[PDB]
Design an enzyme around this catalytic site. Structure first.
Site, mmCIF file in Angstrom:
data_model
loop_
_atom_site.group_PDB
_atom_site.id
_atom_site.type_symbol
_atom_site.label_atom_id
_atom_site.label_comp_id
_atom_site.label_asym_id
_atom_site.label_seq_id
_atom_site.Cartn_x
_atom_site.Cartn_y
_atom_site.Cartn_z
ATOM 1 N N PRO A 1 10.683 20.392 24.390
ATOM 2 C CA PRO A 1 9.631 21.333 24.849
ATOM 3 C C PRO A 1 10.139 22.260 25.952
ATOM 4 O O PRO A 1 10.947 21.860 26.795
ATOM 5 C CB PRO A 1 8.468 20.491 25.358
ATOM 6 C CG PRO A 1 8.678 19.178 24.598
ATOM 7 C CD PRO A 1 10.207 19.003 24.526
ATOM 8 N N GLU A 2 9.660 23.498 25.947
ATOM 9 C CA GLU A 2 10.068 24.466 26.954
ATOM 10 C C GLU A 2 8.828 24.990 27.686
ATOM 11 O O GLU A 2 7.738 24.438 27.533
ATOM 12 C CB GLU A 2 10.851 25.604 26.285
ATOM 13 C CG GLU A 2 11.793 25.107 25.179
ATOM 14 C CD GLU A 2 12.881 26.101 24.801
ATOM 15 O OE1 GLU A 2 12.686 27.318 25.001
ATOM 16 O OE2 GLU A 2 13.934 25.659 24.288
ATOM 17 N N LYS A 57 4.696 24.790 36.279
ATOM 18 C CA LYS A 57 5.512 25.893 36.747
ATOM 19 C C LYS A 57 6.790 25.715 35.939
ATOM 20 O O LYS A 57 7.564 24.789 36.182
ATOM 21 C CB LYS A 57 5.813 25.815 38.247
ATOM 22 C CG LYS A 57 6.533 27.077 38.720
ATOM 23 C CD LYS A 57 6.878 27.088 40.184
ATOM 24 C CE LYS A 57 7.562 28.408 40.526
ATOM 25 N NZ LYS A 57 7.977 28.495 41.943
ATOM 26 N N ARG A 276 24.506 22.456 25.614
ATOM 27 C CA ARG A 276 23.552 22.938 24.628
ATOM 28 C C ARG A 276 24.182 23.920 23.651
ATOM 29 O O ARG A 276 25.181 24.574 23.959
ATOM 30 C CB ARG A 276 22.364 23.597 25.333
ATOM 31 C CG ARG A 276 21.452 22.613 26.056
ATOM 32 C CD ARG A 276 20.755 21.684 25.064
ATOM 33 N NE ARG A 276 19.845 20.748 25.721
ATOM 34 C CZ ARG A 276 20.233 19.730 26.485
ATOM 35 N NH1 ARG A 276 21.524 19.504 26.694
ATOM 36 N NH2 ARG A 276 19.328 18.940 27.048
#
Ligand SMILES: [K+]
Length: 288
Positions: A1-2, A57, A276
């Protein structure tokens, strides 16, 4: 998730638990199964408490709770999802944390790989300190100045993947999709981008984050897909209007882009567990 998944999850979490009374938390398996998160014991001792907010945030999410019988007793739950962290209204497979509220309400956090984290604290100062570790929320902040990008002689992919230097919320798929839309080669150094490209990049960050956030099934928060479509969306980046109805990967984990160009599964940033794979099409993204 981002960024978007975290924000949409908070939204859902607020819809069901804001103003509800939290009575307990159990870590039934995973990393906290035996060794509880920092502050857990003190936190449990102070329950029950009412939830006043669930904010985020970037990729960071937190619960804000207060004690109905002591206005001075304020507590916070710090949370990061990690690659496989998911929240849900049902005890899904790999449930690690079980939040029990009054009146039958329950919340769960699943995490097969165990990369998500938890921390309990009764200090607003520490929370403010933690929030200073993150840059403006790329999804929620509509007036971010990314000209700071020029002051860095590093690949732009690294600058956007970083959560502090320019902004927070961008992950491996968002950065890949955004750099593709802006036709910018991942390796291009920040200091070498033109003011025009900066403007163009800013546009696509707002575009992609908004598209991602408005989606219902990107795949990284499957345990909330039913609820995702049963709740609205806040109006972030108001002046940007994505045309597509759902977020679609143009190069992220694809062998070829929409047209037909080849996509390189390039491993540019990170070391070890932080490494990544950046996906990009050399045909469209140039160092110019
Ligand atoms: K007091």
């Amino acid at each position: 998730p981002e960024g978007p998944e975290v924000a949409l999850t908070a939204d859902i979490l607020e819809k069901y638990f804001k103003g509800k009374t939290l009575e307990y938390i159990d870590f039934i398996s995973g990393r906290y199964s035996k060794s509880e998160p920092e502050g857990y014991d003190d936190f449990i001792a102070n329950l029950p408490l009412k939830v006043s907010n669930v904010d985020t945030k970037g990729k960071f999410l937190w619960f804000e709770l207060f004690d109905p019988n002591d206005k001075s007793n304020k507590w916070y739950i710090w949370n990061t999802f990690g690659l496989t962290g998911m929240w849900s209204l049902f005890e899904a497979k790999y449930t690690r944390a079980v939040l029990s509220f009054d009146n039958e309400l329950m919340a769960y956090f699943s995490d097969m790989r165990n990369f998500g984290t938890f921390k309990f604290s009764n200090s607003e100062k520490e929370l403010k300190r933690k929030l200073n570790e993150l840059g403006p929320d790329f999804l929620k902040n509509d007036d971010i100045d990314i000209s700071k990008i020029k002051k860095y002689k590093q690949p732009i992919v690294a600058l956007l993947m970083d959560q502090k230097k320019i902004g927070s919320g961008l992950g491996n798929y968002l950065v890949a999709e955004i750099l593709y839309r802006a036709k910018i080669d991942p390796h291009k150094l920040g200091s070498n981008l033109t003011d025009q490209e900066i403007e163009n990049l800013w546009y696509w960050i707002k575009y992609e984050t908004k598209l991602a956030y408005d989606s219902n099934h990107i795949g990284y928060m499957v345990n909330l897909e039913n609820e995702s479509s049963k709740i609205g969306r806040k109006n972030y980046h108001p002046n940007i209007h994505p045309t597509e109805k759902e977020f679609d990967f143009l190069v992220y984990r694809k062998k070829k882009d929409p047209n037909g160009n080849k996509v390189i599964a390039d491993k540019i940033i990170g070391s070890g567990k932080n490494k990544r794979t950046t996906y990009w099409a050399p045909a469209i993204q140039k160092l110019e």
